[PDB]
A paper describes a structure:
Another striking feature observed in the S-layer lattice on membranes was the nearly perfect continuity of the S-layer around the vesicles. Rather than having gaps in the lattice, pentameric defects were observed. We next extracted subtomograms at the positions of these defects and produced an 11.5-Å-resolution STA map. This map showed clear densities for all six csg domains, confirming that the pentameric defects are made of the same csg protein. In our data from cells, the number of pentamers appeared to be increased in areas of the cell with a sudden change in membrane curvature. (E and F) Comparison of the single-particle analysis (SPA) hexamer and pentamer structure with the pentamer model derived from STA demonstrates large changes in relative positions of the domains.
Numbering used by the authors:
A (entry chain E): 35 to 352
B (entry chain D): 353 to 510
C (entry chain A): 35 to 193
């Protein structure tokens, strides 16, 4: 039917009944329904009053020559009879999430873990047409049939955060494809594919090269802070960057060793740890500088990389 | 040389076996050269050196040492493999060949002239679990893509 | 509650009651309130009459497909019953001032004296959501937790 589109396993329907909603780019069907029983429609109020809506022809767009609003059969009057309201097609939010959550859109992901991805979106036009998904390689070729896993290319409204194929959303197994940057294309089934009704979600595939670390400088003096970046890690998980206490100056104290790593960037906690307990920057309760053996700073990652910093001050000249 | 043959529109798969191809295109297939660069020529016993080389078509590579017999695996450490970048080049930090634990390193401890080679992940435990854990013989090492170079170890004097 | 947001130590609330105000980019909550008792709303007058407002879905922006104005349950009619007016989100003025006054925005300041700075702003959306502050280094990294001193990253209207 119309308004319950998946109830009949149909990707679209253009049999409009009285009082339903119609979108900008539709192409009404002149068969049985409100396309042959009442092909001429006129506006009711607001900017749409007086303006006519020809259902036998495709409906124009960009809110010109067809103002948004309720449409009568009589126009602005005393009749509330076969009826159409004109909305705008919209895609609001859309994300790519792993089998256990975690947005990975616009961020590089490991080829090994890119085997149970999901695509979800929210769209305004659910009564009229479903929205298609089309995966495109960087060369620009439709690889959808190779990577499709289920749900039949149709993603339902809502269903954002659905990590299972039971809910709305299509799963893509992008593990077999090579490394590169890929674009997922969402657009309406038949007609609603123009601006604000379509969205391109990008995705980067690259080898699971071991976690990459780089420094803005290699030759520095004491006191000069150095920013270190962690690269190519799984989003939402906590890495640990360690500091060997042998490189520390011998005349350092307990409080002097807990400030080697700064809270700059995505760093979560800083302190010094041992094989049994840890001494964080919150309090001087755990191991002391002579008691402890490692200096650490647990750091998360948001996107493809995270940035931290170090204090080269009080470090051995080596 | 490998050829590709296209056929006219509307032809069936079974009926296309005999009809000549409308056009064609040919390409050549070889195997990429995976070679080592730095562990070559001379080596002071007990010293540390980096692993430098290239690998056109590889994901995991292993280093083996041979002397009058089997290619004993050298336990480089983490996962016994080195990844390759987009530039078809793989590298490792400074590693002491004799210092590291394993029976492979024991061959290089004694002074003499030996052989060292690298091999791609085509071994994969010569069939089995996804890990390089064997001592491949001459036939097994040569069968896959690999390369070896002569190395000799010299004594260390302060 | 809604309209008095800091009274419950909340950074936001989406439980709209009858007669309140709603902004362009909101995402109404379909829980108890005017999101399950009356999810369908229609315009009243002006350019918004006849146009519908779907509260169960996020509200569009840039004054297209959702004209600004008061919305009835019946439309342009003789009923004044569950009710929403649609405004636009706005930040009017904002400045950085030293501990004893003096705007220092867009101007170089000494590192020694840059230790008691303040950030203030005026925003239209005070009933709905507070406004966040995020300090970014020239390299482009969130250093807010390092430089924060108080007020919990939330700045009130006025002030």
């Amino acid at each position: 039917e119309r308004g319950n589109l998946d109830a009949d396993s149909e990707s679209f329907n253009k049999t409009i009944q009285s009082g339903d909603r119609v979108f900008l780019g539709e192409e009404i069907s002149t068969d049985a329904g409100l396309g042959a029983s009442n092909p001429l429609l006129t506006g009711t109020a607001g900017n749409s009053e007086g303006v006519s809506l020809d259902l036998s022809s495709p409906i124009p767009q960009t809110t010109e020559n067809q103002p948004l609003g309720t449409y009568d059969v009589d126009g602005s009057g005393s009749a509330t009879t076969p009826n159409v309201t004109l909305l705008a097609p919209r895609i609001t939010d859309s994300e790519i999430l792993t089998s256990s959550g975690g947005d990975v859109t616009g961020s590089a992901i490991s080829s090994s873990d890119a085997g149970n991805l999901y695509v979800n979106a929210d769209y305004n036009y659910e009564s009229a047409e479903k929205v298609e998904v089309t995966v495109e390689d960087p060369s620009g070729t439709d690889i959808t049939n190779e990577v499709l896993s289920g749900t039949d290319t149709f993603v339902d409204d809502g269903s954002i955060g659905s990590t299972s194929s039971t809910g709305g959303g299509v799963g893509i197994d992008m593990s077999d494809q090579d490394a590169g940057e890929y674009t997922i294309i969402l657009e309406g089934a038949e007609d609603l594919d123009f601006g604000d009704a379509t969205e391109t979600m990008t995705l980067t595939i690259s080898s699971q090269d071991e976690i990459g670390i780089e420094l803005d400088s290699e030759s520095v003096t004491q006191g000069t802070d150095v920013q270190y970046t962690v690269t190519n890690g799984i989003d939402g998980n906590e890495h640990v960057v360690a500091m060997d206490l042998s490189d520390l100056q011998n005349d350092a104290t307990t409080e002097q060793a807990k400030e080697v790593f700064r809270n700059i960037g995505d760093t979560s906690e800083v302190g010094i740890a041992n094989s049994s307990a840890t001494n964080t920057s919150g309090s001087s309760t755990g191991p002391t500088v002579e008691t402890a053996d490692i200096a650490y700073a647990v750091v998360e990652i948001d996107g493809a990389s995270a940035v931290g910093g170090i204090e080269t001050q009080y470090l051995d000249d080596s | 040389e490998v050829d590709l043959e296209v056929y006219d529109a509307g032809v069936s798969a079974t009926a296309a076996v005999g009809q000549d191809a409308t056009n064609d295109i040919t390409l050549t297939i070889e195997e990429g050269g995976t070679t080592l660069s730095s562990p070559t020529g001379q080596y002071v016993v007990g010293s540390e050196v980096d692993i430098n080389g290239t690998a056109t078509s590889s994901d995991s590579v292993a280093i083996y040492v041979r002397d009058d017999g089997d290619w004993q695996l050298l336990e480089i450490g983490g996962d016994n493999e080195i990844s390759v970048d987009s530039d078809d080049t793989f590298e490792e930090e400074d590693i002491a060949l004799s210092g590291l634990s394993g029976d492979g390193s024991s061959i290089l401890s004694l002074t003499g002239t030996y052989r060292i080679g690298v091999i791609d992940a085509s071994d994969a435990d010569v069939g089995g679990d996804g890990s390089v854990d064997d001592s491949l013989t001459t036939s097994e090492f040569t069968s896959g893509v690999s390369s070896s170079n002569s190395i000799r170890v010299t004594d260390q004097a302060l």
